[PDB]
Tab-separated table of C-alpha atoms (C1' of nucleotides) and ligand atoms in Angstrom:
chain	number	residue	atom	x	y	z
A	1	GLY	CA	-34.405	47.133	25.837
A	2	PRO	CA	-34.778	48.751	22.398
A	3	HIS	CA	-30.988	49.260	21.871
A	4	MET	CA	-29.538	45.825	22.822
A	5	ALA	CA	-28.795	44.303	19.421
A	6	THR	CA	-29.822	40.647	19.366
A	7	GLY	CA	-27.623	39.318	16.580
A	8	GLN	CA	-30.610	38.270	14.456
A	9	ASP	CA	-29.424	40.126	11.274
A	10	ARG	CA	-28.180	37.112	9.284
A	11	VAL	CA	-29.322	33.604	8.340
A	12	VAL	CA	-26.395	31.288	8.390
A	13	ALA	CA	-26.339	27.521	7.675
A	14	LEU	CA	-23.753	24.978	8.350
A	15	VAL	CA	-23.876	21.892	6.060
A	16	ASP	CA	-21.878	18.761	6.960
A	17	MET	CA	-21.688	15.606	4.860
A	18	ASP	CA	-22.616	12.531	6.964
A	19	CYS	CA	-19.653	10.269	7.446
A	20	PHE	CA	-18.183	11.729	4.206
A	21	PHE	CA	-15.359	9.446	3.287
A	22	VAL	CA	-17.604	6.475	4.078
A	23	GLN	CA	-20.276	7.733	1.662
A	24	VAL	CA	-17.761	8.299	-1.078
A	25	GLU	CA	-16.510	4.765	-0.844
A	26	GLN	CA	-20.225	3.539	-0.557
A	27	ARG	CA	-21.178	5.384	-3.763
A	28	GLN	CA	-18.205	3.756	-5.566
A	29	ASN	CA	-18.854	0.227	-4.056
A	30	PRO	CA	-22.671	-0.619	-3.592
A	31	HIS	CA	-21.657	-3.735	-1.548
A	32	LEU	CA	-20.847	-1.238	1.210
A	33	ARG	CA	-24.093	0.660	1.281
A	34	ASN	CA	-26.395	0.583	4.319
A	35	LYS	CA	-23.844	-1.639	6.376
A	36	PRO	CA	-21.423	-1.121	9.219
A	37	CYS	CA	-18.385	0.187	7.474
A	38	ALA	CA	-15.450	2.409	8.137
A	39	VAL	CA	-12.579	4.009	6.128
A	40	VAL	CA	-9.052	3.332	7.298
A	41	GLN	CA	-5.491	4.645	6.542
A	42	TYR	CA	-2.790	1.925	6.195
A	43	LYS	CA	-3.274	-1.675	7.175
A	44	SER	CA	-0.159	-3.262	8.853
A	45	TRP	CA	-0.169	-1.661	12.310
A	46	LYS	CA	-3.311	-3.079	13.987
A	47	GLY	CA	-5.391	-3.143	10.839
A	48	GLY	CA	-5.050	0.468	10.072
A	49	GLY	CA	-6.331	3.693	11.763
A	50	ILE	CA	-10.053	4.434	11.140
A	51	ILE	CA	-10.831	7.886	9.993
A	52	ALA	CA	-14.564	7.637	9.140
A	53	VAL	CA	-17.488	5.547	10.378
A	54	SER	CA	-20.955	4.820	9.068
A	55	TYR	CA	-23.934	5.402	11.480
A	56	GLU	CA	-24.615	1.658	11.382
A	57	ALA	CA	-20.998	1.020	12.598
A	58	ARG	CA	-21.154	3.714	15.163
A	59	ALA	CA	-24.177	2.092	16.786
A	60	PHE	CA	-21.592	-0.751	17.756
A	61	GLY	CA	-19.086	1.789	19.282
A	62	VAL	CA	-16.858	2.161	16.469
A	63	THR	CA	-15.124	5.569	16.363
A	64	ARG	CA	-12.739	7.625	14.483
A	65	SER	CA	-9.000	7.337	15.544
A	66	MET	CA	-9.486	3.783	16.623
A	67	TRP	CA	-7.453	0.780	15.281
A	68	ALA	CA	-9.318	-1.337	12.847
A	69	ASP	CA	-8.442	-4.684	14.744
A	70	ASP	CA	-10.123	-3.078	17.802
A	71	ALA	CA	-13.220	-1.831	15.872
A	72	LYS	CA	-13.468	-5.486	14.601
A	73	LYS	CA	-13.669	-6.522	18.280
A	74	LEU	CA	-16.666	-4.323	18.642
A	75	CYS	CA	-18.211	-4.979	15.317
A	76	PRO	CA	-17.120	-8.346	13.728
A	77	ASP	CA	-19.140	-7.666	10.506
A	78	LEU	CA	-17.497	-4.315	10.116
A	79	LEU	CA	-16.652	-3.546	6.455
A	80	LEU	CA	-13.581	-1.470	5.652
A	81	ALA	CA	-12.531	0.661	2.716
A	82	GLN	CA	-8.887	1.692	2.413
A	83	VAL	CA	-7.546	5.223	1.539
A	84	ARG	CA	-5.496	5.152	-1.525
A	85	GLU	CA	-1.726	4.888	-1.158
A	86	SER	CA	0.629	6.698	-3.448
A	87	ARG	CA	4.445	7.195	-3.232
A	88	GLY	CA	4.238	5.298	0.142
A	89	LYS	CA	1.658	7.707	1.741
A	90	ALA	CA	-2.092	8.176	2.075
A	91	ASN	CA	-3.510	10.144	-0.868
A	92	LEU	CA	-6.802	11.841	-0.217
A	93	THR	CA	-7.423	12.902	-3.927
A	94	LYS	CA	-10.802	10.978	-4.208
A	95	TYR	CA	-12.210	12.854	-1.258
A	96	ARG	CA	-11.038	16.260	-2.262
A	97	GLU	CA	-12.764	15.632	-5.687
A	98	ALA	CA	-15.887	14.458	-4.168
A	99	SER	CA	-15.730	17.524	-1.877
A	100	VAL	CA	-15.566	19.876	-4.816
A	101	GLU	CA	-18.632	18.176	-6.516
A	102	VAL	CA	-20.601	19.026	-3.256
A	103	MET	CA	-19.220	22.557	-2.867
A	104	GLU	CA	-20.003	23.477	-6.471
A	105	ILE	CA	-23.645	22.418	-6.003
A	106	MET	CA	-23.892	24.377	-2.750
A	107	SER	CA	-22.312	27.507	-4.557
A	108	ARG	CA	-25.378	27.662	-6.858
A	109	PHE	CA	-27.657	28.648	-3.839
A	110	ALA	CA	-25.536	31.123	-2.017
A	111	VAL	CA	-21.916	32.213	-1.169
A	112	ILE	CA	-20.184	29.446	0.818
A	113	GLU	CA	-17.132	29.403	3.099
A	114	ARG	CA	-15.409	25.939	2.834
A	115	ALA	CA	-14.732	24.971	6.512
A	116	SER	CA	-13.236	21.655	5.833
A	117	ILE	CA	-13.211	18.888	3.179
A	118	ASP	CA	-16.780	17.972	4.148
A	119	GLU	CA	-18.464	20.999	5.537
A	120	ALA	CA	-19.241	24.667	4.483
A	121	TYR	CA	-21.068	27.639	5.922
A	122	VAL	CA	-23.759	29.415	3.962
A	123	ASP	CA	-24.791	33.040	4.158
A	124	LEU	CA	-28.554	32.780	3.222
A	125	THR	CA	-29.519	36.308	4.108
A	126	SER	CA	-30.036	37.563	0.520
A	127	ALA	CA	-31.526	34.297	-0.587
A	128	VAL	CA	-34.183	34.428	2.178
A	129	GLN	CA	-35.022	38.023	1.384
A	130	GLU	CA	-35.503	37.217	-2.356
A	131	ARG	CA	-37.640	34.083	-1.462
A	132	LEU	CA	-39.799	36.087	0.958
A	133	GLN	CA	-40.557	38.544	-1.724
A	134	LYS	CA	-41.386	35.846	-4.061
A	135	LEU	CA	-43.822	34.378	-1.672
A	136	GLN	CA	-45.613	37.651	-1.258
A	137	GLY	CA	-47.334	36.685	1.978
A	138	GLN	CA	-47.901	32.915	1.473
A	139	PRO	CA	-47.752	30.862	4.535
A	140	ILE	CA	-45.030	28.199	4.764
A	141	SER	CA	-46.263	24.598	4.557
A	142	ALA	CA	-44.839	21.689	6.661
A	143	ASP	CA	-44.470	19.812	3.366
A	144	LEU	CA	-41.515	22.244	2.555
A	145	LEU	CA	-39.727	21.075	5.593
A	146	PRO	CA	-39.762	17.202	5.510
A	147	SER	CA	-36.535	16.770	7.479
A	148	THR	CA	-36.326	19.770	9.624
A	149	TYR	CA	-36.145	19.699	13.418
A	150	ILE	CA	-37.181	22.820	15.409
A	151	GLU	CA	-34.975	22.869	18.458
A	152	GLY	CA	-36.769	23.190	21.851
A	153	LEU	CA	-40.096	21.978	20.293
A	154	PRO	CA	-42.450	20.371	21.002
A	155	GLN	CA	-43.187	21.751	24.419
A	156	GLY	CA	-46.197	21.759	26.692
A	165	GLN	CA	-41.894	7.750	17.664
A	166	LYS	CA	-39.107	10.106	16.506
A	167	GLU	CA	-40.764	11.304	13.275
A	168	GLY	CA	-43.969	11.967	15.234
A	169	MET	CA	-42.058	14.210	17.678
A	170	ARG	CA	-40.500	15.946	14.724
A	171	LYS	CA	-43.679	16.829	13.094
A	172	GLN	CA	-45.358	17.880	16.260
A	173	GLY	CA	-42.394	20.418	16.864
A	174	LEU	CA	-42.599	21.614	13.265
A	175	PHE	CA	-46.430	22.087	13.598
A	176	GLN	CA	-46.171	24.224	16.795
A	177	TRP	CA	-43.377	26.309	15.177
A	178	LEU	CA	-45.412	26.931	11.894
A	179	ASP	CA	-48.639	27.616	13.702
A	180	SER	CA	-46.803	30.234	15.827
A	181	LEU	CA	-45.293	31.845	12.664
A	182	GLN	CA	-46.249	35.520	11.635
A	183	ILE	CA	-46.004	35.364	7.847
A	184	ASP	CA	-47.078	38.919	7.203
A	185	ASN	CA	-43.836	40.423	8.852
A	186	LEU	CA	-41.238	40.212	6.251
A	187	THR	CA	-38.580	41.232	8.986
A	188	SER	CA	-39.336	38.673	11.734
A	189	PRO	CA	-36.102	36.887	12.362
A	190	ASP	CA	-37.973	33.508	12.919
A	191	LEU	CA	-39.746	33.778	9.667
A	192	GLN	CA	-36.308	34.403	8.062
A	193	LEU	CA	-34.816	31.228	9.685
A	194	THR	CA	-37.815	29.338	8.488
A	195	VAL	CA	-37.289	30.283	4.870
A	196	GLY	CA	-33.583	29.780	5.303
A	197	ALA	CA	-34.540	26.145	6.308
A	198	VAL	CA	-36.821	25.695	3.249
A	199	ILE	CA	-33.760	26.680	1.078
A	200	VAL	CA	-31.553	24.347	2.927
A	201	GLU	CA	-33.952	21.387	2.330
A	202	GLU	CA	-33.693	22.337	-1.318
A	203	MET	CA	-29.891	22.471	-1.198
A	204	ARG	CA	-29.752	19.190	0.541
A	205	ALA	CA	-32.066	17.599	-1.992
A	206	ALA	CA	-29.959	18.922	-4.991
A	207	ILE	CA	-26.775	17.486	-3.238
A	208	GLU	CA	-28.248	14.104	-2.854
A	209	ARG	CA	-29.856	14.118	-6.381
A	210	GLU	CA	-26.611	15.076	-8.122
A	211	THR	CA	-23.954	13.316	-6.043
A	212	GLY	CA	-25.778	10.558	-4.041
A	213	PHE	CA	-24.378	12.059	-0.869
A	214	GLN	CA	-26.479	12.723	2.219
A	215	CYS	CA	-25.804	15.492	4.720
A	216	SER	CA	-27.002	17.164	7.898
A	217	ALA	CA	-27.387	21.003	8.342
A	218	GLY	CA	-27.832	23.559	10.977
A	219	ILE	CA	-29.773	26.830	10.375
A	220	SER	CA	-29.494	29.731	12.741
A	221	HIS	CA	-28.388	33.402	12.928
A	222	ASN	CA	-24.522	32.918	13.021
A	223	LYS	CA	-21.809	30.279	12.235
A	224	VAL	CA	-21.386	29.048	15.784
A	225	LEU	CA	-25.048	28.327	16.341
A	226	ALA	CA	-25.441	26.905	12.888
A	227	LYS	CA	-22.531	24.477	13.605
A	228	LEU	CA	-24.103	23.456	17.090
A	229	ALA	CA	-27.434	22.942	15.414
A	230	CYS	CA	-26.196	20.818	12.693
A	231	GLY	CA	-24.978	18.203	15.232
A	232	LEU	CA	-28.332	18.028	17.092
A	233	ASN	CA	-30.035	15.685	14.696
A	234	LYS	CA	-27.836	13.480	12.604
A	235	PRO	CA	-27.781	11.732	10.078
A	236	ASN	CA	-29.721	13.107	7.034
A	237	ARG	CA	-31.642	15.734	9.033
A	238	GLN	CA	-31.463	19.496	9.562
A	239	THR	CA	-32.111	21.631	12.765
A	240	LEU	CA	-33.322	25.159	13.117
A	241	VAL	CA	-31.937	26.897	16.320
A	242	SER	CA	-33.827	30.050	16.778
A	243	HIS	CA	-32.612	33.037	18.814
A	244	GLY	CA	-35.396	32.355	21.373
A	245	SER	CA	-34.223	28.694	21.984
A	246	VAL	CA	-30.816	29.780	23.101
A	247	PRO	CA	-31.526	30.207	26.905
A	248	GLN	CA	-32.970	26.686	27.354
A	249	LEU	CA	-30.512	25.052	24.898
A	250	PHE	CA	-27.486	26.734	26.434
A	251	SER	CA	-28.646	26.107	29.997
A	252	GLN	CA	-27.518	22.417	29.915
A	253	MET	CA	-24.950	22.782	27.045
A	254	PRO	CA	-21.461	21.783	28.242
A	255	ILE	CA	-19.019	24.693	27.457
A	256	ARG	CA	-16.824	22.170	25.437
A	257	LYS	CA	-19.536	21.655	22.860
A	258	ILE	CA	-19.237	25.218	21.396
A	259	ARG	CA	-16.905	25.635	18.492
A	260	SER	CA	-13.381	26.798	19.859
A	261	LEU	CA	-14.119	26.046	23.339
A	262	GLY	CA	-13.315	22.275	23.121
A	263	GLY	CA	-9.750	22.731	24.238
A	264	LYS	CA	-7.487	24.628	26.739
A	265	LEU	CA	-9.606	27.896	26.663
A	266	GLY	CA	-12.777	26.031	27.400
A	267	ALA	CA	-11.156	24.057	30.244
A	268	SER	CA	-9.922	27.282	31.776
A	269	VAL	CA	-13.448	28.983	31.467
A	270	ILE	CA	-14.713	25.996	33.392
A	271	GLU	CA	-11.857	25.982	36.044
A	272	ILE	CA	-11.518	29.833	36.621
A	273	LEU	CA	-15.254	30.583	36.622
A	274	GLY	CA	-16.373	27.431	38.476
A	275	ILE	CA	-19.154	26.629	35.824
A	276	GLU	CA	-20.141	23.849	33.516
A	277	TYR	CA	-22.703	25.083	30.946
A	278	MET	CA	-22.687	27.737	28.246
A	279	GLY	CA	-25.646	29.610	29.872
A	280	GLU	CA	-23.923	30.284	33.234
A	281	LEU	CA	-21.661	32.608	31.265
A	282	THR	CA	-24.464	35.211	31.222
A	283	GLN	CA	-23.863	36.074	34.784
A	284	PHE	CA	-20.532	37.617	34.269
A	285	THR	CA	-19.891	41.053	32.925
A	286	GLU	CA	-18.133	41.679	29.787
A	287	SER	CA	-15.146	43.225	31.707
A	288	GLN	CA	-14.825	40.213	34.043
A	289	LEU	CA	-14.711	37.865	30.955
A	290	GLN	CA	-12.041	40.080	29.297
A	291	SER	CA	-10.050	40.164	32.595
A	292	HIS	CA	-9.834	36.419	32.745
A	293	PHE	CA	-9.537	35.618	29.029
A	294	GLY	CA	-8.355	38.649	27.257
A	295	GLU	CA	-10.188	41.452	25.363
A	296	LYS	CA	-11.149	39.496	22.245
A	297	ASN	CA	-12.152	36.182	23.901
A	298	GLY	CA	-14.022	38.139	26.604
A	299	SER	CA	-16.198	40.079	24.160
A	300	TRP	CA	-16.687	36.994	22.169
A	301	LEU	CA	-17.880	34.906	25.258
A	302	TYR	CA	-20.037	37.758	26.569
A	303	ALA	CA	-21.869	37.686	23.150
A	304	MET	CA	-21.783	34.027	22.474
A	305	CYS	CA	-23.424	33.038	25.641
A	306	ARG	CA	-26.333	35.217	24.665
A	307	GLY	CA	-26.488	33.624	21.210
A	308	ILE	CA	-24.666	36.371	19.400
A	309	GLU	CA	-21.649	36.052	17.212
A	310	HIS	CA	-20.509	38.296	14.377
A	311	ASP	CA	-17.854	36.162	12.567
A	312	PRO	CA	-18.759	36.473	8.877
A	313	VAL	CA	-19.328	33.743	6.395
A	314	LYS	CA	-16.199	34.249	4.272
A	315	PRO	CA	-16.601	33.935	0.476
A	316	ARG	CA	-13.933	31.213	0.042
A	317	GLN	CA	-14.669	27.850	-1.675
A	318	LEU	CA	-11.052	26.834	-2.164
A	319	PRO	CA	-8.454	26.018	0.472
A	320	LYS	CA	-6.009	28.671	1.302
A	321	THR	CA	-3.020	26.276	1.556
A	322	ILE	CA	-2.190	22.925	-0.142
A	323	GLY	CA	-0.358	20.405	2.174
A	324	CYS	CA	1.369	17.055	2.252
A	325	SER	CA	2.088	15.294	5.656
A	326	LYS	CA	3.364	12.065	7.013
A	327	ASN	CA	4.123	10.715	10.339
A	328	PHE	CA	6.985	8.350	10.991
A	329	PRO	CA	6.091	7.093	14.363
A	330	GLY	CA	7.869	4.610	16.635
A	331	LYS	CA	10.737	2.637	15.156
A	332	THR	CA	9.847	3.906	11.557
A	333	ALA	CA	11.283	7.341	12.385
A	334	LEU	CA	13.740	8.489	9.731
A	335	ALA	CA	17.371	8.050	10.800
A	336	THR	CA	19.532	8.701	7.810
A	337	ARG	CA	20.142	11.319	5.111
A	338	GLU	CA	18.998	9.126	2.277
A	339	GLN	CA	15.675	8.577	4.159
A	340	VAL	CA	14.867	12.012	4.872
A	341	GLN	CA	15.635	12.976	1.253
A	342	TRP	CA	13.662	10.305	-0.290
A	343	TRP	CA	10.525	11.111	1.751
A	344	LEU	CA	10.900	14.793	1.039
A	345	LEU	CA	10.842	13.767	-2.519
A	346	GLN	CA	7.720	11.712	-2.309
A	347	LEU	CA	5.931	14.448	-0.471
A	348	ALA	CA	7.137	17.114	-2.967
A	349	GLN	CA	5.983	14.803	-5.897
A	350	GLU	CA	2.377	14.558	-4.461
A	351	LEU	CA	2.612	18.455	-3.773
A	352	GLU	CA	3.612	19.069	-7.447
A	353	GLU	CA	0.815	17.120	-8.672
A	354	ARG	CA	-1.887	18.707	-6.463
A	355	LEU	CA	-0.347	22.197	-7.341
A	356	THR	CA	-0.289	21.775	-11.021
A	357	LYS	CA	-4.029	20.582	-10.961
A	358	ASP	CA	-4.794	23.615	-8.691
A	359	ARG	CA	-3.118	26.119	-11.014
A	360	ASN	CA	-5.046	24.759	-13.989
A	361	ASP	CA	-8.453	24.640	-12.185
A	362	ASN	CA	-8.314	27.701	-9.993
A	363	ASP	CA	-6.003	30.267	-11.878
A	364	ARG	CA	-3.555	30.809	-9.093
A	365	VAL	CA	0.134	29.978	-7.971
A	366	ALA	CA	1.497	29.405	-4.646
A	367	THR	CA	4.602	31.550	-3.801
A	368	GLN	CA	5.892	30.148	-0.388
A	369	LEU	CA	6.824	26.702	0.650
A	370	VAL	CA	6.580	25.817	4.412
A	371	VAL	CA	8.609	22.949	5.773
A	372	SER	CA	7.775	21.581	9.115
A	373	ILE	CA	9.336	18.551	11.006
A	374	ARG	CA	8.938	16.685	14.150
A	375	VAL	CA	12.071	14.950	15.896
A	376	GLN	CA	11.760	11.797	17.936
A	377	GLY	CA	11.134	12.467	21.620
A	378	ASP	CA	10.320	16.163	20.990
A	379	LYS	CA	7.101	17.075	22.959
A	380	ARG	CA	5.846	19.452	20.344
A	381	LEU	CA	3.878	18.634	17.236
A	382	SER	CA	6.123	20.892	15.122
A	383	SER	CA	9.763	20.643	16.230
A	384	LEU	CA	10.626	23.147	13.530
A	385	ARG	CA	8.793	25.282	10.970
A	386	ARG	CA	10.774	27.236	8.228
A	387	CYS	CA	9.656	28.857	5.046
A	388	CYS	CA	11.438	29.412	1.658
A	389	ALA	CA	10.493	30.655	-1.757
A	390	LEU	CA	8.206	28.591	-4.054
A	391	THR	CA	9.100	29.610	-7.602
A	392	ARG	CA	8.438	26.708	-9.850
A	393	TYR	CA	6.222	23.595	-9.469
A	394	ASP	CA	9.079	21.034	-9.598
A	395	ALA	CA	9.174	18.330	-6.979
A	396	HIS	CA	12.912	17.819	-7.215
A	397	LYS	CA	13.544	21.525	-6.482
A	398	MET	CA	10.968	21.686	-3.744
A	399	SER	CA	12.509	18.672	-1.978
A	400	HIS	CA	15.995	20.057	-2.367
A	401	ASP	CA	14.963	23.426	-0.914
A	402	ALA	CA	13.058	21.830	2.021
A	403	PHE	CA	16.238	19.845	2.804
A	404	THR	CA	18.409	22.889	2.395
A	405	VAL	CA	16.113	24.663	4.825
A	406	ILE	CA	15.991	21.803	7.630
A	407	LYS	CA	19.301	20.138	7.316
A	408	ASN	CA	21.026	22.043	10.140
A	409	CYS	CA	18.769	19.911	12.522
A	410	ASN	CA	20.955	16.986	11.994
A	411	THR	CA	23.554	16.465	14.824
A	412	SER	CA	25.352	13.475	13.474
A	413	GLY	CA	29.056	13.421	12.619
A	416	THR	CA	25.159	10.591	6.558
A	417	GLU	CA	23.114	9.749	9.636
A	418	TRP	CA	20.204	11.774	10.928
A	419	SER	CA	19.640	12.446	14.633
A	420	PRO	CA	17.404	13.179	16.460
A	421	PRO	CA	15.278	10.849	14.079
A	422	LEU	CA	12.440	12.494	12.494
A	423	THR	CA	8.854	11.505	13.272
A	424	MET	CA	7.091	13.897	10.896
A	425	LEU	CA	7.661	15.575	7.501
A	426	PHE	CA	5.332	18.228	6.212
A	427	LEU	CA	5.277	20.396	3.211
A	428	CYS	CA	2.801	23.220	2.677
A	429	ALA	CA	2.363	25.472	-0.328
A	430	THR	CA	0.954	28.891	0.811
A	431	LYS	CA	0.744	32.513	-0.218
A	432	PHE	CA	-1.388	32.177	-3.414
A	433	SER	CA	-1.492	34.792	-6.160
A	434	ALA	CA	-3.805	35.000	-9.195
A	435	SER	CA	-2.190	33.534	-12.232
B	1	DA	C1'	1.686	4.003	17.008
B	2	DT	C1'	-5.227	7.990	15.656
B	3	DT	C1'	-3.178	10.271	10.808
B	4	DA	C1'	-3.644	14.027	7.331
B	5	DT	C1'	-4.500	17.908	6.906
B	6	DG	C1'	-6.107	23.147	7.248
B	7	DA	C1'	-7.736	27.790	9.516
B	8	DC	C1'	-6.444	31.063	12.415
B	9	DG	C1'	-4.313	33.811	16.760
B	10	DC	C1'	-0.087	35.526	19.221
B	11	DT	C1'	4.023	37.837	19.483
C	1	LIG	N1	-7.296	12.105	7.211
C	1	LIG	C1	-8.214	12.390	7.982
C	1	LIG	N2	-9.440	12.533	7.626
C	1	LIG	C2	-10.278	12.941	8.608
C	1	LIG	C3	-9.966	13.175	10.005
C	1	LIG	N3	-11.093	13.595	10.628
C	1	LIG	C4	-12.127	13.571	9.777
C	1	LIG	N4	-11.507	13.166	8.495
C	1	LIG	C5	-12.412	13.157	7.285
C	1	LIG	C6	-13.350	11.950	7.111
C	1	LIG	C7	-14.683	12.641	7.492
C	1	LIG	O1	-15.708	11.940	6.751
C	1	LIG	C8	-14.485	13.988	7.034
C	1	LIG	C9	-15.128	15.074	7.758
C	1	LIG	O2	-15.080	14.693	9.213
C	1	LIG	P1	-16.368	15.066	10.244
C	1	LIG	O3	-15.714	15.421	11.670
C	1	LIG	O4	-17.244	16.086	9.593
C	1	LIG	O5	-16.985	13.598	10.340
C	1	LIG	P2	-17.839	12.747	9.183
C	1	LIG	O6	-18.006	13.632	7.983
C	1	LIG	O7	-16.939	11.441	8.978
C	1	LIG	O8	-19.075	12.254	9.950
C	1	LIG	P3	-20.227	13.118	10.492
C	1	LIG	O9	-19.986	14.519	9.901
C	1	LIG	O10	-20.238	13.186	11.932
C	1	LIG	O11	-21.515	12.609	9.865
C	1	LIG	O12	-13.095	14.314	6.969
C	1	LIG	C10	-8.657	12.998	10.393
C	1	LIG	O13	-8.301	13.195	11.444
C	1	LIG	N5	-7.728	12.478	9.459
C	2	LIG	MN1	-19.175	15.149	8.422
C	3	LIG	MN1	-17.422	17.940	9.002
DNA sequence: ATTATGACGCT
């Protein structure tokens, strides 16, 4: 009863840019705005691989990781923007720079954890406390939440439903208790409306967000109402929400572990997990995963929002699938050089912008017919930002994979250079 | 012949 902590200490938001690469291209080219459109990489093989889809195109069934020529069969009016190509590979620079615009706006409100190029977590606990004090008892007006959904409401036209749910929530609110978790979530959501308005004002980009008490719930909430909307998942909404929530929808359970939870326990939904003791879960899935599952199915997670706006590693990758796999020494060298040249550019810009130097180079390769995604990974020292030296060292470090008697065998289907181990500069 | 990344756990 009084001693079961309920994981309501924090207010955490997950902000995700709606179809981010597509919006970047639509800002740059107005002819694409408010249309079925997608962003592709390469163009020769089946029109190119789609990596981002507007919501208009999604309504036709167009999805990420689909060939453009097939997408065109579903959506013949589909419009396509192409990723920039430099040194024979995809160059994502435009999107990393748009991402930094967004992150820098978010950082004005609260400390953020860059979780990917287009999404960040936000620790709003301090911001909510400050804002609650600033209100000094004033009740929260629906006008302050024009795009917020309250999950699980209403109980007992889409915008009409949204407003009814919000009204039920706000009418039920106890504004005089500065320590009510539900009030804290609500003020968090007001702040998130303000953040999303500033992002759209200053970049043109729209986003969705989730507001809850931890990262996993915030992330799950963000996806409930997209695009251009935000969702508040309260502690109290967890039993009903989780009672039909497939386990695979929870962050980190979408893969093998989630499938084994399903297979070993004989269950389907997150909420069914409540019926197992902590020890049972640890027995099946190990101590860490067991404790984490026991708390997560009750809506409780303690992973902190890390104060980290910048990526921890800077990486350059290219697949050489099918018959394009690299089969000679000259080929492996020339592509290591192309990769090292993009890496040098990104690293020099990173050192100037962010006052830090990488110190370790990681080289990863895949060989043709190898089951694994990394056939090998080896590290060496990264001492100067010189593409010729980094490519020479990556070769020096992988070359004993060749089994030829100037040829290269097994042919290489992936090269990957990653600068890691940053130190302040 | 989804690709290009990037965080993090295990041992
Ligand atoms: N190169 C590459 N980029 C990807 C890949 N997956 C996603 N991206 C890019 C394009 C996306 O806009 C962005 C973030 O991906 P998300 O999963 O958040 O989807 P997206 O933002 O496109 O749409 P949504 O958030 O659902 O509105 O990162 C990928 O596999 N390869
Ligand atoms: Mn997104
Ligand atoms: Mn995202």
